[PDB]
Design brief:
Two copies of one chain form a homodimer. Chain A is built from twelve helices and seven strands. In chain A, helix 8 (159-173) links the parallel strand 2 (149-153) and strand 3 (177-182). Chain A has three domains: 1-67, Helicase, Ruva Protein, domain 3; 68-132, Orthogonal Bundle (Glutamate Dehydrogenase, Chain A, domain 3); 133-286, Uncharacterised protein PF01937, DUF89, domain 3 (Rossmann fold, 3-Layer(aba) Sandwich). Chain A is α/β, with parallel strands linked by helices and 286 residues long. Chain A has a seven-stranded mixed beta sheet, with helices on both faces. At the A-B interface, helix 1 and helix 2 of A face helix 1 and helix 2 of B.
Chain lengths: 286, 285
């Protein structure tokens, strides 16, 4: 279902949107009054939070007159993450196990507020010593080696430069063609196809759109082109909580979820402690 | 009233969530309660909202939905026990003038009495805090108004705090011939002191304990009892504890009112025109 924590989670994101979009306190108030009404409309027993939330966020974008409140935050994260990834490529020679861990850690770091790329890279080195709570990385390793087609479904900007490192490793060990999916247009901090393209990811695989400005992969809304890639994939790597929430409904063992279980609802869905790092194949557990 | 601020929606939502968590571990009941909370938020979070009132009305509906007249009861019992004990130490150790007794009442607004197990350690921290200067201190004006009052109304806030309030009320009784009316809530709402709480702290020995007539935080001037309104009118000085009392009373042009609070939330700080977290004894201007 929807979980009880989802209301505050969505409201908090709404608040972050209005804060990014304007400094005018009157506009912020009016935006949040609208948000309350939209939350009440969308937050019900049948709701899928990635989709419900996203539709609320996009209506607020319209109310605020700003089609992408996060443009600056995203540019800041990209610039930092690019430099951090460059130091990592220089200082570390990651094996596959640690590349997977690095991809997950990329989901965790706030690249927009760091001191320096070196300071952040040192934090990353410490986090690379953390143990995955669920760890199907060895199975991912085997599957990618035998794959002819791999779909990589991204999450946030910043993170995508760590994803690129994992994708480089995949190309070192597999002959598969890699498809790399981003969003059609901006939604919160998520990477769009133009963000992926601007980062040079077309050097690593074919960049494709999900067809939506919705978080995750809303299977009834995504494009026909996305589905063709989805259906042909031998292996599907899905980054972050939204992709998990939208893809964990379905029975499909090709999918590996790489995320941090930041929200208690997701931690409870996964049956892990809050904050756990996870590489988990989409199979029945218990 | 006081214009609602954009950050008040998450504040209220968060409080709703803390209520459902405290009331039950059943995840399906929690979900259904937060689904209701969303509807109530859309109803009450509007251009006319005063957060103390709007929030309280939402919280009371959640109490009803949950079948729990007071989800905070175990916290409150813990806070009352700790506060009573700390206040007894204070009363044995310290001689306090009026200024310090005012600061103490404000400090009581600051402390979470539900945490920890050492009255000595907490009382030591209270003694530390008494040496700090209030950001705004109108307690000399208060002192003189109190000495001259024929009637005083003291409007409480939270349980725990009300044991510190009792120390200030005792000091008031020493230096004034005013009849003191002491107002609490009709029934439980969050951690606020009710009429029964005030009576259990022995406050009927010091003044007339009365109800606001509501289970709403602060003083909702359209909803309070005729008895409370009569006490409010009769007062020559009104002492109002905490943010909620401030939010609801800041609308009126009435120099009888002195606010004793910490500006814990940024909306209140912004309205008071003081730094976040500032401790004040401030006459309504």
């Amino acid at each position: 279902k929807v979980q009880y924590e989802c209301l505050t989670c969505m409201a908090n994101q709404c608040q972050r949107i209005v804060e990014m979009a304007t400094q005018d306190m009157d506009i912020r108030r009016r935006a949040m009054i609208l948000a309350a009404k939209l939350l009440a409309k969308e937050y019900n027993e049948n709701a899928i939070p990635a989709i419900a939330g996203s539709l609320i966020f996009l209506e607020l974008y319209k109310f605020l007159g700003n089609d992408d409140p996060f443009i600056e935050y995203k540019l800041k994260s990209e610039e930092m993450a690019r430099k951090v990834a460059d130091i990592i490529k220089r200082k570390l020679k990651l094996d596959f196990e640690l590349a997977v861990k690095l991809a997950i850690i990329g989901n965790v770091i706030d690249f927009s507020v760091g001191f320096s790329p070196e300071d952040l890279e040192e934090e990353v080195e410490k986090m690379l010593k953390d143990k995955l709570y669920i760890d199907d990385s060895k199975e991912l390793f085997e599957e990618v080696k035998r794959a002819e087609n791999i779909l990589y479904i991204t999450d946030n900007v910043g993170e995508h430069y760590f994803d690129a490192i994992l994708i480089e490793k995949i190309r070192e060990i597999s002959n598969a063609e890699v498809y790399i999916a981003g969003k059609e247009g901006p939604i919160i901090n998520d990477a769009t196809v133009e963000d992926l393209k601007r980062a040079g990811l077309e050097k690593l695989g074919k960049v494709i759109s999900t067809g939506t400005r919705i978080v995750g992969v809303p299977l009834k809304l995504v494009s026909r082109e996305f589905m063709e890639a989805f259906n042909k994939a031998d292996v599907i790597i899905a980054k972050g909580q939204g992709n998990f929430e939208t893809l964990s409904e379905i029975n499909d063992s090709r999918i590996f979820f790489l995320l941090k279980a930041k929200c208690p609802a997701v931690a409870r869905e996964l049956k892990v402690p809050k904050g756990a790092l996870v590489c988990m194949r989409n199979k029945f557990k218990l």
